[PDB]
Amino acid sequence: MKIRRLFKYHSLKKKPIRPTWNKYNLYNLATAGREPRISGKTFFQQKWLAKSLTRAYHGEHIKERKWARMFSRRLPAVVNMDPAYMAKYNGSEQAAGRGSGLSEPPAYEKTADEKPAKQVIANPGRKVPTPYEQMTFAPLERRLDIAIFRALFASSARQARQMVVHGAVTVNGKKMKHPGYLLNPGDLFQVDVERVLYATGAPKDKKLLAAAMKAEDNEIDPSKPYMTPWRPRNYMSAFAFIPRYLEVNQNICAAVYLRHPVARPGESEVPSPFSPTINQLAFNWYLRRG
Amino acid sequence: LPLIPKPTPFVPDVPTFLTLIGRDLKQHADKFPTWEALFTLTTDQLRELGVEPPRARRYLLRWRQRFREGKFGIGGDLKHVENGVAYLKIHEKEASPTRTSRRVVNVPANQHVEEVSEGERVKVKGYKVKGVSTIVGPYALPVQKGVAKLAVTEGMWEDKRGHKVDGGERRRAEVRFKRGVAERKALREKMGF
Amino acid sequence: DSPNYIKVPEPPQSSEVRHPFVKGHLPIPRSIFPKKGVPEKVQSGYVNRIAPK
Amino acid sequence: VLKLRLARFGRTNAPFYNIVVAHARTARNSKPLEVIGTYDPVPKKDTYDTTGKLHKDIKLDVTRAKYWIGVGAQPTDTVWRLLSLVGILDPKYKKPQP
RNA sequence: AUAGAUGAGUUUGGUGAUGGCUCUGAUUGAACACUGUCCAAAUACUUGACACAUGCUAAUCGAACGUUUAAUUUUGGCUCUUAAUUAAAAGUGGUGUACAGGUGAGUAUAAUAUUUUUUCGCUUAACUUAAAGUGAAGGCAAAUCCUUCAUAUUGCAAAAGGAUAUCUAUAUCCGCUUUAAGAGGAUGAGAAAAGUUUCAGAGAUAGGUAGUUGUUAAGGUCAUGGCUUAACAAGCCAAUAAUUCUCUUAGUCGAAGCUGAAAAGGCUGAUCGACCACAUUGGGAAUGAAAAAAUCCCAAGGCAAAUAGGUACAGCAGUGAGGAAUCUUGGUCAAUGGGCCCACGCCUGAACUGGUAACUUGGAGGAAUGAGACGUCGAUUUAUCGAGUAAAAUUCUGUAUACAUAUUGAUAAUGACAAUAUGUACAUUUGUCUU
Numbered sequence A: 001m002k003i004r005r006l007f008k009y010h011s012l013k014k015k016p017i018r019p020t021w022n023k024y025n026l027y028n029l030a031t032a033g034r035e036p037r038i039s040g041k042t043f044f045q046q047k048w049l050a051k052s053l054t055r056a057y058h059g060e061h062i063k064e065r066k067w068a069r070m071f072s073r074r075l076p077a078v079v080n081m082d083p084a085y086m087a088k089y090n091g092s093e094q095a096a097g098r099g100s101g102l103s104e105p106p107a108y109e110k111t112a113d114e115k116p117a118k119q120v121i122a123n124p125g126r127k128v129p130t131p132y133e134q135m136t137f138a139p140l141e142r143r144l145d146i147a148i149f150r151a152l153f154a155s156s157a158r159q160a161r162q163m164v165v166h167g168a169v170t171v172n173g174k175k176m177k178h179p180g181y182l183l184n185p186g187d188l189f190q191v192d193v194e195r196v197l198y199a200t201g202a203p204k205d206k207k208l209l210a211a212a213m214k215a216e217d218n219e220i221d222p223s224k225p226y227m228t229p230w231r232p233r234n235y236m237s238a239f240a241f242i243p244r245y246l247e248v249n250q251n252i253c254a255a256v257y258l259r260h261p262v263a264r265p266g267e268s269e270v271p272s273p274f275s276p277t278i279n280q281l282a283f284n285w286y287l288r289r290g
Numbered sequence B: 001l002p003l004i005p006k007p008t009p010f011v012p013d014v015p016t017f018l019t020l021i022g023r024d025l026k027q028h029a030d031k032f033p034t035w036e037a038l039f040t041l042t043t044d045q046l047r048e049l050g051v052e053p054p055r056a057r058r059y060l061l062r063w064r065q066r067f068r069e070g071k072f073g074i075g076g077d078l079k080h081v082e083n084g085v086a087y088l089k090i091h092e093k094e095a096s097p098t099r100t101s102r103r104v105v106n107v108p109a110n111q112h113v114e115e116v117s118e119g120e121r122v123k124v125k126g127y128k129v130k131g132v133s134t135i136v137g138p139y140a141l142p143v144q145k146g147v148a149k150l151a152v153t154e155g156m157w158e159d160k161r162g163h164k165v166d167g168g169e170r171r172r173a174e175v176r177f178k179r180g181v182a183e184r185k186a187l188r189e190k191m192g193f
Numbered sequence C: 001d002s003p004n005y006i007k008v009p010e011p012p013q014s015s016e017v018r019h020p021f022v023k024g025h026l027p028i029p030r031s032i033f034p035k036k037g038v039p040e041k042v043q044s045g046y047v048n049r050i051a052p053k
Numbered sequence D: 001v002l003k004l005r006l007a008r009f010g011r012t013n014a015p016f017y018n019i020v021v022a023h024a025r026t027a028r029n030s031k032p033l034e035v036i037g038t039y040d041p042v043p044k045k046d047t048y049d050t051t052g053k054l055h056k057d058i059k060l061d062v063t064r065a066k067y068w069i070g071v072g073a074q075p076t077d078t079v080w081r082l083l084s085l086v087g088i089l090d091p092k093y094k095k096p097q098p
Numbered sequence E: 001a002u003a004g005a006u007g008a009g010u011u012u013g014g015u016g017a018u019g020g021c022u023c024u025g026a027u028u029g030a031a032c033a034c035u036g037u038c039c040a041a042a043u044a045c046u047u048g049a050c051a052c053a054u055g056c057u058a059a060u061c062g063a064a065c066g067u068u069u070a071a072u073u074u075u076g077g078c079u080c081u082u083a084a085u086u087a088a089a090a091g092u093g094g095u096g097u098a099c100a101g102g103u104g105a106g107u108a109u110a111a112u113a114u115u116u117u118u119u120c121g122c123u124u125a126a127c128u129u130a131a132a133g134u135g136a137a138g139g140c141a142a143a144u145c146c147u148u149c150a151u152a153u154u155g156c157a158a159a160a161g162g163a164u165a166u167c168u169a170u171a172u173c174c175g176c177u178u179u180a181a182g183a184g185g186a187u188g189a190g191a192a193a194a195g196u197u198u199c200a201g202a203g204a205u206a207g208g209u210a211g212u213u214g215u216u217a218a219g220g221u222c223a224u225g226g227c228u229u230a231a232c233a234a235g236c237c238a239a240u241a242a243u244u245c246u247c248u249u250a251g252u253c254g255a256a257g258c259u260g261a262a263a264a265g266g267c268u269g270a271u272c273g274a275c276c277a278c279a280u281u282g283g284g285a286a287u288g289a290a291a292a293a294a295u296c297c298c299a300a301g302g303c304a305a306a307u308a309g310g311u312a313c314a315g316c317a318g319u320g321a322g323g324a325a326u327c328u329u330g331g332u333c334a335a336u337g338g339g340c341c342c343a344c345g346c347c348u349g350a351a352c353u354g355g356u357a358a359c360u361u362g363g364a365g366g367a368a369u370g371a372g373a374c375g376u377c378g379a380u381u382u383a384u385c386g387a388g389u390a391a392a393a394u395u396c397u398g399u400a401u402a403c404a405u406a407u408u409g410a411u412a413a414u415g416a417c418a419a420u421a422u423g424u425a426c427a428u429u430u431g432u433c434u435u
């Protein structure tokens, strides 16, 4: 039963960015506006616009009520500590001066002096912001059906959900048929090779195959759902990327959920096609759903 | 695993076995084609044949297990039965010059007690001798002085289910009251009018 | 396939999982000894005295 | 009369039991004096064992159960069979060999 | 628990304040309207403690006891009449109906309540260990019923018998009485020291206490205390309501349910556990180790009954009524629990399971490709903008579910009903609100 919300799934007029590799979706992603118009809109009109844009991609197949409580105000992050710094300094120099360290001359004086002041001691890679706003939809990255789509085992989040519901996935060597299963750090999910080749392979064309009847490497086998010899789907390279909280092994179509997505200074691990301005309004919406 | 026990002189066939245990199980005497079918059919097979309600099927499976283990009812240890009738007689031994031990033994209806040998002079359990020349025990009807017969009877081994009198304790005074109303009302129709 | 194939313990204070409050209670087992002193129930010949043969 | 018995919990077609120390004449699921353990009747199977062998998980505080059996507690037939396997009491029933 | 604290519309000619109202968030044992495919779990008269047709929810032991007819077999007399066996049916006695289950009408509280530590006492049933004793009459048809006696460290104070084997009287089984312990307990006002208890709303009332407060003496008590008694003293508590009374409302409580960022938060007092009360209304006692009864006695009105003396579904299902509104007159004692029983076994509307309801929650309810059918439809800058990757079609999957097999819920044995696993097969709705 097709609901009213899925009619214009890849509308070229509305241009919604969906979690799939469809060619109509590639055009909507490439030609997306550099910045949505939020000049004269009110605070509600901005949060609703950001909520509609983001929810068109993140957890598209999950009800609004289920995600409303799946949303978490806890945005995890990490910091990089260089052993070379911690071995030479105990952090006292960071509390010099009046508690915040010594003062450096303003920028309009440094370059004036031909001699640059000695490098200030500090852990390398500091004074760079962390994109917390970009982690609004991190909880969705823990579902089994989503992790399968992020491992490049399926062409869409809905096709990966069918692999689970149809007993084609195996977590920790045990059959798992719940797409809402929340992976734990260390879980190893494995999909059937036959479903991955069809999901990511090219469509089976009879007209072109009809000409190839008789006229390492592989051969032809018309007794398989995908076109032989197996070749990658068209436009699959535009969506080819594996996040760092997964360790995929394509030889067996298996991956390990190493950890949860975290935000690092200057980087986020949640695949989202939206800017911090939109992810900041979506986060503000789900604080009180208004 | 499903070992079948050999029939006994007192329970030679299935119709006799179902007649003893009671619970109106002799109705299904035709479901079991042979003695080996009774002790071989399973719960699911007894259910298809139509052995119901579940109370009768579970009751049958229970007595089926007792027969295997040898936990017969009364008279099951007999050894000289004919057409379902067994005769019990008394055997007297001189335990001392001033005493005498009497035992209820089962012997053929013709041979005398003293004539039978120790091998065939079976001693039935559950039956004793009261005083002299009197056999006491369930279903022991007297035939003559010092003799009693034990015939196969319906429900001889049955675990009789308990029954209520006037509907039990809660509905005792009411069933008797309403019953008393029906009595008086009847007399009026007979002599009143 | 099991996550316990290779044991890599996590460093301390690296997770902040919030366990949910469990509803309900269990009966508190009664105390069998007094809170002070050594009772006569744990002596050498106690059982043989209160449960002779 | 103290008894070591089972309190049926769980859901429809999902039985789960508590081994408890309760007075005989009380409700089955009323709060007992103590909860000595749990008992799951449905046998489970090891995750990565393809041999087909099954097992039953039973948590029991043997030290606390021995004290109640020592003071005169009467375990039910089901709890008796469990206590006989661990090696506290003698079985009440056995498979006839003949 | 360290992330948890937020606003919006609306008074004025206008501005800033004050102060309500409404919306924004979450939820319900909900109801109604428009709708609705399947599955699981959970919940399901919130109102009239209103009235109830019918079947069931507490029975069990013949190894406590004789009666009663039935046949069977034996005596005397010549069908009747003795003494027995056997089977049934009512009973007598033992235990249990002091548990389980149901309801919230009444009930307005600080109390011989309660926590901690120290010190204690009582316990004639049942459970666990052990010891000793288990004789003699009478009454009922008989008895392990009732009455009574002997004996039981001194002297007062107990008991009950039944059943099964062995031999060419002995030994056992199940009980009974007493005693010493363990456990349990609803136990004694236990006591002392230091604490705790958010005690509904409104109104009135200044006295209350008469072993009452203290002393002496005595008794009682494990001990303490007018706990008890005699003789003296006139005290003790309170003064802002101690005490008493009227009206209104209500079962109490818990992270039990809902809710807030939070407050000794607020609200509720369903399902779960604890406690209290009640069993048509009112007035009562006995039995028992203990009232802890849906028991018993009595009165009244309703129904039934009249020469009787039952009944009250707030036990399960069900009916009528009331109401916006809440379901089956199923199966099984297989599992768990309980009563009776030497044992086997019997009973269990407790319980477990099938049914009804979108009431709630959880899950399924389909994925990928789809470009010139050079077709259709609606707007309209009649040539632009849309329906539209939408459809058709193509390639796959086999989800709820159906069927089959196996295992499992259960073992000494017992499966009412169903779960899980595996294999094969199937592509099935839109609805509703707003602008």
Ligand SMILES: [K+]
Residues within 6 Å of the ligand: none
């Ligand atoms: K009761």
Ligand SMILES: [K+]
Residues within 6 Å of the ligand: E104, E251
């Ligand atoms: K009430």
Ligand SMILES: [K+]
Residues within 6 Å of the ligand: E313
């Ligand atoms: K009812």
Ligand SMILES: [K+]
Residues within 6 Å of the ligand: E333
């Ligand atoms: K049962």
Ligand SMILES: [Mg+2]
Residues within 6 Å of the ligand: none
């Ligand atoms: Mg003015």
Ligand SMILES: [Mg+2]
Residues within 6 Å of the ligand: none
């Ligand atoms: Mg009600």
Ligand SMILES: [Mg+2]
Residues within 6 Å of the ligand: none
């Ligand atoms: Mg209540």
Ligand SMILES: [Mg+2]
Residues within 6 Å of the ligand: none
């Ligand atoms: Mg005697």
Ligand SMILES: [Mg+2]
Residues within 6 Å of the ligand: E194
């Ligand atoms: Mg103190």
Ligand SMILES: [Mg+2]
Residues within 6 Å of the ligand: E211, E226
């Ligand atoms: Mg006094």
Ligand SMILES: [Mg+2]
Residues within 6 Å of the ligand: E250
């Ligand atoms: Mg009330």
Ligand SMILES: [Mg+2]
Residues within 6 Å of the ligand: none
């Ligand atoms: Mg009534």
Ligand SMILES: [Mg+2]
Residues within 6 Å of the ligand: E323
């Ligand atoms: Mg009506």
Ligand SMILES: [Mg+2]
Residues within 6 Å of the ligand: none
């Ligand atoms: Mg039982």
Ligand SMILES: [Mg+2]
Residues within 6 Å of the ligand: none
């Ligand atoms: Mg028994």
Ligand SMILES: [Mg+2]
Residues within 6 Å of the ligand: none
């Ligand atoms: Mg299936």
